[PDB]
Multidrug exporter ATP-binding cassette (Bacillus subtilis), 1140 residues
Amino acid sequence: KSKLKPFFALVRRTNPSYGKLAFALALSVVTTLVSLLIPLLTKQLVDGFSMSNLSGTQIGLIALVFFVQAGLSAYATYALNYNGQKIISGLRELLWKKLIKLPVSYFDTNASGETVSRVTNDTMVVKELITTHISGFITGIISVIGSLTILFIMNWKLTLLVLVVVPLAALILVPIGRKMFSISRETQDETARFTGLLNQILPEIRLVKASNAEDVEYGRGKMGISSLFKLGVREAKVQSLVGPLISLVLMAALVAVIGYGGMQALVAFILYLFQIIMPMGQITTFFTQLQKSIGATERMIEILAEEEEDTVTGKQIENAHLPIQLDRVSFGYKPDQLILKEVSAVIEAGKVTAIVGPSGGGKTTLFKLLERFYSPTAGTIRLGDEPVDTYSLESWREHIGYVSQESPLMSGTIRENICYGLERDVTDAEIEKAAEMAYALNFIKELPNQFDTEVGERGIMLSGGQRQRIAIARALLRNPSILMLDAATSSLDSQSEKSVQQALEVLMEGRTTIVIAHRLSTVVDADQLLFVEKGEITGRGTHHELMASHGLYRDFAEQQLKMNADLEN
Amino acid sequence: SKLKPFFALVRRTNPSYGKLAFALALSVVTTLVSLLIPLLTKQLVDGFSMSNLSGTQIGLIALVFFVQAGLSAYATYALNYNGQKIISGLRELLWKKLIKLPVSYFDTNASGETVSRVTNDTMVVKELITTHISGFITGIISVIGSLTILFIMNWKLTLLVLVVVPLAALILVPIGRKMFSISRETQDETARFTGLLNQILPEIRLVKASNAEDVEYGRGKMGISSLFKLGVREAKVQSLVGPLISLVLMAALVAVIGYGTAGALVAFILYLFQIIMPMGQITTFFTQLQKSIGATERMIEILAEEEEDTVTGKQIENAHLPIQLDRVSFGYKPDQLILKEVSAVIEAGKVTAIVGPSGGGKTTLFKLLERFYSPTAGTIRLGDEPVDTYSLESWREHIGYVSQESPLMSGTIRENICYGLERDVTDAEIEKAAEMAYALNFIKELPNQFDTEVGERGIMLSGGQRQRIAIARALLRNPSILMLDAATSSLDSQSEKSVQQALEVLMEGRTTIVIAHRLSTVVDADQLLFVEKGEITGRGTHHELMASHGLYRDFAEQQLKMNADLENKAG
Ligand SMILES: Nc1ncnc2c1ncn2[C@@H]1O[C@H](COP(=O)(O)OP(=O)(O)OP(=O)(O)O)[C@@H](O)[C@H]1O
Ligand SMILES: Nc1ncnc2c1ncn2[C@@H]1O[C@H](COP(=O)(O)OP(=O)(O)OP(=O)(O)O)[C@@H](O)[C@H]1O
Ligand SMILES: [Mg+2]
Ligand SMILES: [Mg+2]
C-alpha cells in the first residue's frame, strides 16, 4: 500500500472540477442515515394500519412527493460519472502534452504504438471503477462505523473483540491486493503493447499481403493477442476468491463472540453482525480495484515524469544570416557504440554546401544533430554566440526548413501537409507559388483540387514523385534561411527532377542550403562538398579537389560515367 | 432487427455456453432462498434462538453451509470465464478477416480506425456481460417469483400492475434506442481519433522539425478530450433511468389505492417494493444490451466482407511462363481510368523494364501485376492461359515483388528476411541471400543479425540498409519473377552496382521486371517500356525511342547530358 501514495498524488493534480464530487458525497450520507434509522423507526405498524384509508386521502398525498428525494439520488450517481469522465479526459489531456513535447530519443528505446494504447486503453481502466470506487467505499465505511457505534452502546466487551478479529484477519486481503496490482499492470502492458502489434502489420498490408500475410501474420496476431488477453482470466480468478475469504474472516469472530460470551441479548448481538458483513464486501473490493487502477496507471506517471524539450531560453534571435560551424563534434545512439567521432566543417552562410557519402556513414544522423534533435557527446555548433540547450529552440526552427530522407505524409489533403507550420499566417496566393517551385502544382491540379484530394494512411493515394515534392513545397511555404534535401529526388525521375533544382537555385541565392545526394551528378555545382564515410568527413571542397583527395575516393564520377558511356555507343 | 446479428455472432462463431449453465444454476438456487426467506423467517426470533438448547451444534447449521455461500463466488467466475472467452473470441474472429482482407479496403476506410476498432470495441461488452445475465436473470426470476405469490392473496389488483408497468415501460425504449446511437457513434469517434493520434506519434521526427508540436497537441486536445466527454451525454442518459422507474410505479399507485377489504390493503403495498428493486436490474440490462449492440454494430459489418483467396489452378512445379497484357484498363476512382488500355509482352527468363514520369502508372501497373487489383476491361495471360486459373495463394509463393516503399516492422533483420513462411529456412540460406543484396557486409558491422531490432518502421537503420534487406527478403524465397520499383533510389551509385551484379547471375534463366528513376541503371534491359499518363508509349531498348518517337527522345536521353559535365572539367 506504499504504491498508493505516488499515484493518488497524480490523481489529485488531474482535476478540472471537484465541487460536483461534494454533491455525491452529500446524498451518500443522507441515504445511509436512512438505512441505519430504518431498523429503529420501523417497529410501529398498528398506527398506520388503522389510518390507512382516511389519513391517506388528505395527508397521504405528501408520501408521493418523497420520490423526488428518491429520484435525486440518481443525480448524485451522475456526479461520480461526471467527475469520472473529467478525470479520464484529464489524464488524456496530460499524457498527450508530454508526448508531443517529448524528445526524439524516446522513440528509439520505447516504440510508438506502445505509447498510444497506454494512453487510450489504460485511461478507460479507472473509469469503470471510479463510479463504484468512492460510491462503494464511502457508503460502506459510513454504515460499518454506523452499525458498530450502535453495538458499542449495547455491548462493550464483545463489540471490542470484533475490532481485534476482522482488521487483524484483513491482513489476508493484502496478498489479494499486492497480487492484483501486478496482475492488472502486466495485462495493461502486455496487451497495451499488443494493440501496437496490429498497428505495424495492418497499415503495411499493401506490402505484407502476399503468401506471407495470408495466415502466418494471423498467428502472431491471434496467438499472442488471445493468449495474452486471457491473462485477465487469472485477474477474474483472484477477484472471485475475495468472497470466500470474507466469509472465513467472520468465522474467527464467531469463536470470539459465541465461545467467549456464551460460556461467560446473545441472539440480538448476532443480528447486527450481518449488517456490517454486507458493506465489508463493498470496502474489500474497493481496496483490490484501487490496486487494479494503480497497477494500470503505474505506466502513466513514469511516462509523465520525463525531461521535456525547452522552447524559450536566453534570447530569441529570429533574423540573423549566421554561418554554420562544427568543432570536435562526436555522437552516438548508445555510449559504448558511437556513430560520429569528432567532426569539424564550416558551412558558409548564403552559399549552397553539400554532403555525399556511402549508405550507413553518418549523413542523416549529422543532419538530425543539425535540425537540433540530439545533443553531441563532446562537440558543439557555433551559431549566434550560443551552443545547443541554452539557445532558443523555437526561434531555431522558426527560420529553418528541413526536409529529411523519408517523405512525411498524414491523413487529410495536400493543403494540410504544406500548411503544417506557422498556422493561419498563409493565404491562397502563397501555396500556389510554393507548390509551383516544387513542381507538384502541375499534378496537384490534375486530380480533383488541392484541398480536396486526400493522401490517406502515410499517403498511399499518391505516388513517390508526388509525395516527395509536397514535402519540398511545405519547406518552400515557410521561406526559410536554411533549406535541406536528404535525397529528395531519389525515386523522382531525372526529367521531373531538373525543374525542382532550377527553382530552388533562384530563391536561395542569398540564403544557405545544405543538401544530401545519392548521385554526385545532381550536386555537381555545390559550393563545399563534404564526404561522409563511416562517421567522419574525409573529402572537402569542389570536384577539382575531390579527385585529388585519395585513391579510394575517386568514385565521384568514376562510377556514374561508366554506365553513361554505354548509351552513347 | 439489430439484436439478431449480435446473439447469432455471439453463438455460432463465439466459444461459450459451457460454464454458463453453472452460473445460471446457482442464480436460481440463491433467488429460491430470498423469496422463501419472508415465508420461513416468520418465526426467526425463536429460529436463530433454537441453537441454545443444542449447545455447540452450530458447527453444521452455519459453519458447513458457508461452502454453499462460498460456491456462489465460483458462479460469478463462470460469467467472467465466458466473458473473457467471448471477448477473446471476437478478437480471434475480426483479426482473421483483416489479414485476409483485400488491399482496396485500406484506400477507403483506412487502417488506424479498423485497428483500434477491434481492441477497444471488444472491451465494451466485457464490463457489461458480467452483470448482463447476472442482473437480468436474477431480476426476472424474482419479478415473476414475487408476482405469483401476489396472485394467491389477490386476483384483481395484481392483474392491474401487469397493464400499468409494461404499458409504461414504453418510455424506456426512447432511453434504449438513444443509448444505441450514443455508444455506436462514440465508438467511431474514439477509434477514428485515437487511431488518428497514432499517425502523428511515429512520425514525431518530423513533428519536432516544423512548428507543429502545439498545433498537433491542439488536434489532440480539442479532438480526443472534445469527443471523449461525449460519454458525459452517455452517463447523463443512464442517470435518467432511476427517476423514470420511480415515476412508472406512481401510475400503479392510482391503479391500486384509488381502485381498491382494508386489512390486506397494507399487505399488498409491502410486496410492491420487492419487485421495484429487480425492476431496476432488468431496465439497466436493456440499456446496456443496446450499449453493446451499438458498439458491436461495426464488428459485424467489418466481419461480413469479401476476402482475398481463390482455389482455381494449382502451383506450376517451377516453370516460368511469359507475361502478357490485352486491353488492360484500371482506375481506383471509376471517373478516371488512371492506368488506361494497355498491352505489352514480357518475355520469360528475360530481364525487361519499365520507366515513365512520376504519376504515370508504373507502380499501379505492378500492383495489378502482383495481382492485388482486378482490371476493369482487360486480363493478364501467362503462357496462353490467364493469371486467374492459378490461385493467388500460390502466385506469390513463386513470385517475389519488392515494391517502391522499403517495408520494415518491429522484428530484427532476420525476421524481416525470414518473413516468407518462417522456420522453412536454414542459417546457410539467409547468409547467402543477404550477401547478394550486399547488406550482409553492413549487418556484420553492428552486433549480430538475429540480435539487431530495426524498430517502428526500421528507424534504427539507414535508407541504404533498409532497402537492401527488402531485396534480401525476395532473394531468400528464390522466385521466378523478381521486382525492383526504384530499389536503388536513396542507395549510393557505388553501393548500388554490387547489387545489380549479383541479381544478374541469379536471374539469367528467370524473369525480372524492374522500375528505374535514372535510365543509366537499366541501360542493358531486354524490353524497356515507357509509362506516360497511363499507357505504354515506347517499346524496347532506348535506341528505338531515340529514333522512332518524336516526343520521348529528350526523355530517354536526359541522363546523358546530366553527368556529361563530370568529365568536361576534370578531364
Ligand atoms: N536510431 C538510429 N537512427 C539512425 N541511425 C542509427 C540509429 N541507431 C544506430 N544508427 C546507425 O546509424 C547508421 C545510419 O546513419 P545515417 O542515417 O546518417 O546514414 P547515411 O549516411 O545518411 O546513409 P543513407 O543515405 O543510407 O541514409 C546505421 O547504419 C546505424 O549503424
Ligand atoms: N490509392 C492509390 N494508389 C496509387 N495510386 C493512386 C491511388 N489513388 C490515385 N492514384 C494515382 O495513381 C497515380 C499512379 O501511381 P504510381 O505510383 O504508379 O505512379 P508512378 O508513375 O509510378 O510515379 P512514381 O515513380 O513517382 O511513384 C498516382 O500518381 C496517383 O495520382
Ligand atoms: Mg541517413
Ligand atoms: Mg511509383
Observations:
- Chain A is about 55% helix and 5% strand.
- Residues 123-154 of chain A form the longest helix (32 residues).
- Residues 1-311 of chain A form one domain.
- Residues A 447, 460-466, 491; B 107, 332, 338, 356, 358-364, 404 surround adenosine-5'-triphosphate (ligand 2) (CB under 6 Å).
